[PDB]
């Protein structure tokens, strides 16, 4: 799997420069210039056959060409079969994602479908990572999805939604791996938000509320196009971390953790959440 | 009135005033008494107390004040917000086609979106100029500075792309005497150029070769999502710079850069300082 | 069963603040270590090339100085510890009698009437639980189909836990580094029961529980060496996935460390 | 000295967030245990009268059920661990040769050319340091006036640390429960160097370091039994006071556990 990395290839008069995350080169070869323009045109992954073809076309040796393209930071070779073979985005605001499938190919992310939550007969194949993103939060929406899809072989879920002035991305919820679910997350945040000066959320006020059917909405500030834009980028980069072209490796101790963002301050907070004691996700 | 940092040094009956922009022989006893007094008073003072001090030291009020302002002992700053409006000058102005409308409800007031490629850019007094560039060249900053440095109450802030980073510079205000764009990057290049052992694979080599070849530095392979992220950072910094005085707000709100790693989406807020060698200090 | 304790008795003393703060902390140390994440994650903050400088060294109380009281090695009457086994080889059948030898010697008294274990414990509370995982079809088994067991050090008995197959259990325990590990016959997994670690001494109990884990796997190391088993203590696993596979409830109990056992060709 | 590592090399990799969060947590487990605080503090959240029900028990994976695979005790070839000594008695002189025997056997290879210790370690980083405290005037000493030493397991040597007197050092290590403890000849104190525990594996390193502490004091237990020393691992001490007395800098290093050694009349 040849992954095409971020770069530009710029020319003016007779000077041509390649610039990547890794390096910059004064390109003194027409063939390699052509190769590089062609690659800059393609989104994301390329068949090693296309690459060889493009090299042979410019009369460039294949291993010399490749070694150049790898070490200078233009491409890289990845070997591993990934955990989720496919992603879907399920949303109350699917319009916000109408170019995502197309654009995010260049980031090496395969999103197969954008699904409106309003739709019945929602289908998801095996080993699919389900991204559920809600602007208008309701816990019944999450329950419905877990209920439809928890049993799917190799499934996992991410949930994103707003709380107060924060954008929340939950840890990856994977029945197979035993990781905390949405409700483990939102209880962790509703606990922290109580002006309690206490980590422990439990009291008779909470006990009495647990007698009622679990059900809730979340208070959050109104979104503009700019908050949506910011949200779109974190979704993409989070999906990219998990299933796309890795640019920066994550430590094993944080790879699956929640990501929270203050929309005022733009500061990220990456944080592993514990299982909620009153939650059912471990018993399923 | 803000009292700026300065030093006075004495030996024999001699006294030497040094400020951020000046070095001055003080031979008038009155002015030694005025400077010694201001040296121990920390920051913001009232016009009334300054005038009381001058009268005491037998120094013309008008002339004494002109001296202190001109040598950079004091600046005559607003208790109300420093910039009543703001304008965005960009090589990608279309990214801001709704910004004026939208950012209203964030309390952010942008009067005009302006294409850098426009000939004949005008800009009102007491306006903050946001220069945003996907294609960075230092002469673009030089041009904007030359045109507007002289406008009453003008300030500048610059955003651009360096490899994986989105950099927002500090606010450059002639009136307040805060660092400029070049105080960062020219100093950074100086340090590469004058390294004790030049790293022969320095990023200065790319930057210097782009001058030599008359080429801009492109942002690397921006999509919609990176522009959305950028857009929001811009909105939120402008919000930070709105309703702002030196009475409301500390200088570190201005003398700070924001760098955002576009991959990790992590922000890095760093202090910005003056460079003795920069020509913003005349 | 004769020396049974019900966790209901324990929870009557739990400070829920303490339990929440300890678990919040503990979980920061959990890993997402899987073959499928190899090329997008890492383990070491130190590059491979700079590591040797940090391995098997002494930090000095007076760095740069060399004045010491030397001690004779003539006092040492021990054997050198065997190197920790790597890419294990399961060509040989391994008997239940060998696993049994390890279990009773590392964790139990020779007197089955006695309750005094070969390792000490804060408050004699013994919050750490030993689970047995069978990882090779060439490993003998007590109850066909059962690959996870719980060792009861005082009854000196195995309690069936799980009938997961042998491939799934190897996958959970072996993280992304399974190819280097090779093929061990079996593993022990050492697990903390949080409320049992915390109820008496509060936060300091967490500290005492992790140290206990070490006293335990160390006895196993020494016992393994003596009965001619290779072993490797192992931290390269996905905590929750191991937990899941062994049917542990992560709200109560968590795997601290895995220890692998077998041959080496 | 030959295998010296400078902590300056280590700190180049420190995540300061990680270090702060680990120390914040660690310090929650520190004790203020002093004779003068006996009547206004407590240690156990469980009353003395309910404790026995919790001591030396088994938690079951299927509570209330008794179906198990029993294992023969005929496989056990070990000696029973001695009871942990209490009110130690310092009537007998105790030689440096005996302390030396313990040190080289518990923590060092028999081969002084080898760097392979008798306990394993995450990343071979060995973040845990052993200090020696001399607590009795009836204990022989290598360098008169020096009662704290640092053991260098690879050089097999003692590094002088402190010339605090023997009464002060006993007071710090023995908390408020000194009268029950009696009079040990000496103690080992096991200490974590935080940045050394954290730099490579981050939070999981803390977990690996505390477990290592346990592997270490366990070797000491087994070695003590074999050379006819009594011992008791001990958590009843004021962490910072011990640190202070041993002239450790608490920003870098902290005592995890004390272990007492001596006779019992």
């Amino acid at each position: 799997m040849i992954n095409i990395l971020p770069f530009e290839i710029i020319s003016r008069n007779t000077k041509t420069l390649l610039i990547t995350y890794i390096s910059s080169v004064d390109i003194t070869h027409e063939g390699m210039k052509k190769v590089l323009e062609s690659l800059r045109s393609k989104q994301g992954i390329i068949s090693e056959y296309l690459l060889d073809k493009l090299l042979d076309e410019s009369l460039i040796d294949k291993d010399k060409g490749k070694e150049f393209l790898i070490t200078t930071g233009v491409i890289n070779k990845t070997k591993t079969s990934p955990l989720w073979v496919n992603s879907v985005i399920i949303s109350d605001v699917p319009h916000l994602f109408s170019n995502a499938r197309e654009q995010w190919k260049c980031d090496g992310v395969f999103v197969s479908h954008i699904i409106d939550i309003k739709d019945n007969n929602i289908n998801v194949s095996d080993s699919t990572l389900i991204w559920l993103h809600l602007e208008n939060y309701h816990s019944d929406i999450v329950k419905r999805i877990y209920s439809k899809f928890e049993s799917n072989p190799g499934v996992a879920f991410i949930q994103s939604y707003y709380l107060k002035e924060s954008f929340r991305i939950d840890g990856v919820y994977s029945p197979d791996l035993g990781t905390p679910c949405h409700f483990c997350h939102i209880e962790r945040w509703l606990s922290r938000e109580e002006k309690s000066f206490r980590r422990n959320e439990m009291s008779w006020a909470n006990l009495l509320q647990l007698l009622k059917k679990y059900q809730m909405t979340l208070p959050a500030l109104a979104l503009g196009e700019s908050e949506r834009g910011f949200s779109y980028h974190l979704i993409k980069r989070r999906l990219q971390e998990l299933t796309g072209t890795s640019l920066v490796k994550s430590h094993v101790d944080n790879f699956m953790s929640s990501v929270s963002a203050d929309l005022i301050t733009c500061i990220l907070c990456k944080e592993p959440v514990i299982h909620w004691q009153a939650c059912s996700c471990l018993e399923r | 009135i803000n009292i700026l940092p300065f030093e006075i040094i004495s030996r024999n009956t001699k006294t030497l005033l040094i400020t951020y922009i000046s070095s001055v022989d003080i031979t008038h006893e009155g002015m030694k008494k005025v400077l010694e007094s201001l040296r121990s008073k920390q920051g913001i003072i009232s016009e009334y107390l300054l005038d009381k001090l001058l009268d005491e030291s037998l120094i013309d009020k008008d002339k004494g004040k002109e001296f202190l302002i001109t040598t950079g002992v004091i600046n005559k700053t607003k208790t109300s917000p420093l910039w009543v409006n703001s304008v965005i000058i960009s090589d990608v102005p279309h990214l801001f086609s709704n910004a004026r409308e939208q950012w209203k409800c964030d309390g952010v007031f942008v009067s005009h979106i302006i294409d850098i490629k426009d000939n004949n850019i005008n800009v009102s007094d007491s306006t903050l100029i946001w220069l945003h560039l996907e294609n960075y060249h230092s002469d673009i900053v030089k041009r904007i500075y030359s045109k507007f440095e002289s406008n009453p109450g003008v300030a500048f802030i610059q955003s651009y792309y360096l490899k994986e980073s989105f950099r927002i510079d500090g606010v450059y205000s002639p009136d307040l005497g805060t660092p400029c764009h070049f105080c960062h990057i020219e100093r950074w290049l100086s340090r590469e150029e004058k390294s004790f052992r030049r790293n022969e694979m320095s990023w200065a080599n790319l930057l210097q070769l782009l001058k030599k070849y008359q080429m801009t530095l492109p942002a690397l392979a921006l999509g919609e999502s990176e522009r959305g992220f950028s857009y929001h950072l811009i909105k939120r910094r402008l919000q930070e710079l709105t309703g702002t005085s030196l009475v409301k707000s500390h200088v570190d709100n201005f003398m700070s850069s924001v760098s955002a790693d576009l991959i990790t989406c992590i922000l890095c807020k760093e202090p910005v300082i003056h460079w003795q060698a920069c020509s913003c200090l005349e | 069963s004769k020396h049974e304790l019900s966790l209901v008795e324990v929870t009557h003393y739990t400070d829920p603040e303490v339990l929440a703060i300890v678990k919040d902390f503990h979980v920061r140390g959990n890993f997402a270590s899987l073959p499928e994440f190899a090329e997008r994650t890492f383990v070491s903050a130190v590059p491979l090339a700079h590591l040797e400088k940090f391995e098997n060294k002494e930090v000095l109380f007076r760095p740069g100085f060399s004045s010491v009281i030397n001690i004779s090695s003539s006092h040492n009457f021990s054997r050198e510890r065997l190197p920790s086994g790597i890419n294990f080889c399961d060509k040989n059948k391994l008997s239940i009698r060998t696993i049994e030898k390890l279990l009773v010697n590392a964790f139990s008294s020779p007197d089955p009437g006695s309750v005094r274990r070969p390792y000490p414990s804060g408050g004699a509370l013994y919050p750490i639980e030993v689970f047995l995982c069978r990882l090779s079809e060439n490993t003998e088994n007590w109850q066909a189909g059962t690959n996870v067991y719980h060792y009861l050090p005082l009854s000196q008995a195995l309690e069936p836990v799980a009938t997961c197959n042998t491939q799934s259990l190897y996958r959970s325990l072996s993280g992304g580094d399974s190819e280097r590990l090779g093929k061990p016959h079996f593993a022990l997994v050492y697990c903390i029961i949080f409320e049992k670690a915390l109820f008496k001494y509060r936060y300091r109990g967490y500290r005492m529980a992790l140290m206990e884990t070490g006293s335990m796997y160390q006895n196993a190391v020494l016992v393994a060496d003596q009965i001619g088993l290779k072993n490797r203590v192992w931290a390269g696993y996905t905590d929750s996935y191991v937990a899941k596979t062994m049917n542990l409830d992560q709200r109560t109990v968590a795997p601290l460390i895995v220890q692998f056992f077998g041959d080496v060709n | 000295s030959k295998h010296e590592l400078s902590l300056v090399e280590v700190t180049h990799y420190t995540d300061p967030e990680v270090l702060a969060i680990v120390k914040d947590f660690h310090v929650r487990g520190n004790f203020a245990s002093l004779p003068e605080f006996a009547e206004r503090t407590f240690v156990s959240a469980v009353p003395l009268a309910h404790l026995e029900k919790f001591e030396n028990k088994e938690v079951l994976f299927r509570p209330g059920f008794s179906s198990v695979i029993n294992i023969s005790s005929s496989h056990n070839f070990s000696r029973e661990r001695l009871p942990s000594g209490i009110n130690f008695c310092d009537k007998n002189k105790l030689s440096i040769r005996t302390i030396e025997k313990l040190l080289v056997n518990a923590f060092s290879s028999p081969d002084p050319g080898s760097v392979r210790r008798p306990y394993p370690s995450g990343g071979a980083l060995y973040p845990i340091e052993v200090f020696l405290c001399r607590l009795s005037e009836n204990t022989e000493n290598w360098q008169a006036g020096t009662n704290v030493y640092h053991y260098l397991p690879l050089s097999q040597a003692l590094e002088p640390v402190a010339t605090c007197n023997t009464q002060s050092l006993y007071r710090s290590l023995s908390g408020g429960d000194s009268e029950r403890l009696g009079k040990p000849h000496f103690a080992l104190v096991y200490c974590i160097i935080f940045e050394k525990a954290l730099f490579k594996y981050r939070y999981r390193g803390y977990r690996m370091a505390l477990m290592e502490t346990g592997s270490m004091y366990q070797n000491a237990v087994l070695v003590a039994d074999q050379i006819g020393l009594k011992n008791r691992v001990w958590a009843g001490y004021t962490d910072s006071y011990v640190a202070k007395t041993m002239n450790l800098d608490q920003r870098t290093v902290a005592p995890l556990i004390v272990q007492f050694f001596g006779d019992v009349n």
Partner: peptide, 20 residues
């Protein structure tokens, strides 16, 4: 050096990216 160009700059940290 290669037949394709000359390297101007390198981010050494990004180019870099049990016991040893």
């Amino acid at each position: 050096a290669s037949e394709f160009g000359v390297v101007l700059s390198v981010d050494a940290l990004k180019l870099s990216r049990g016991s040893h």
